[PDB]
Structure 1
Amino acid sequence: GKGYHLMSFPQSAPHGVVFLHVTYVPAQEKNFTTAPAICHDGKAHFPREGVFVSNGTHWFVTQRNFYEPQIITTDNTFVSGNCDVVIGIVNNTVYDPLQPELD
């Protein structure tokens, strides 16, 4: 079928078979502005699974197939290198969750 497959059900027919394909069509898309990586504390941050999305002022991490924004932490990004080789990187603060417990 057309879309992302979920399941199918068979039905008989006089000299053939009939399938009922259950799928996805994602709908009601809203466009944002993105960035490939984020430079915080002099190192580049990439999303583990998802993308960096900006509403205009703030930056979040969402799934690529459904809008569910989350705060950018170190639990959903992985660091790789310094923020100089990536082109298109932006500036933002990565909320480390260990510091507030210690502080």
Structure 2
Amino acid sequence: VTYVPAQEKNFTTAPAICHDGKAHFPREGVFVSNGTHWFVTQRNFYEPQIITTDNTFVSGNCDVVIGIVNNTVYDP
């Protein structure tokens, strides 16, 4: 008994998010967008979510990565 996925779709992606001069990386997700909004989802199934401080970790300042975008991060 096996598991096979299907019905794929196109999206755009970025390696990291720079907010307030710091680089934010995903925990176990991928950063995706469909337009004017950005979300985080798991690899093997589409499930968007809002970016908070409980699914990202911070390292350094957004000056060393090749490819980084500006966006806001919710603060609970």
- The bucket for the TM-score relative to the shorter chain is over 0.9
Structure 1 unpaired stretches of 5+: 1-21, 97-103
More helix by share: 1
Q: How far apart, in 2, do the equivalents of 1:54 and 1:85 lie?
A: 23
Instruction: Give the count of matched residue pairs.
Output: 75
- TM-score scaled by length of structure 2: 0.94
Question: How much does 1:26 deviate?
Answer: 1.2
Q: SS where residue 39 of structure 2 aligns?
A: strand
Cα root mean square deviation, aligned? 0.7
Which residue in 2 is equivalent to 1:8?
Answer: none
- TM-score scaled by length of structure 1: 0.71
**Relative contact order, CA 8 A, sep 6+: which one is greater?**
2
Over the matched positions of the two proteins, sequence identity in percent amounts to 100
Q: How far apart, in 2, do the equivalents of 1:83 and 1:68 lie?
A: 27
Moved over 2 A (4+): none
Question: How much does 1:63 deviate?
Answer: 0.2
Structure 2 unpaired stretches of 5+: none
Question: How much does 1:41 deviate?
Answer: 0.7
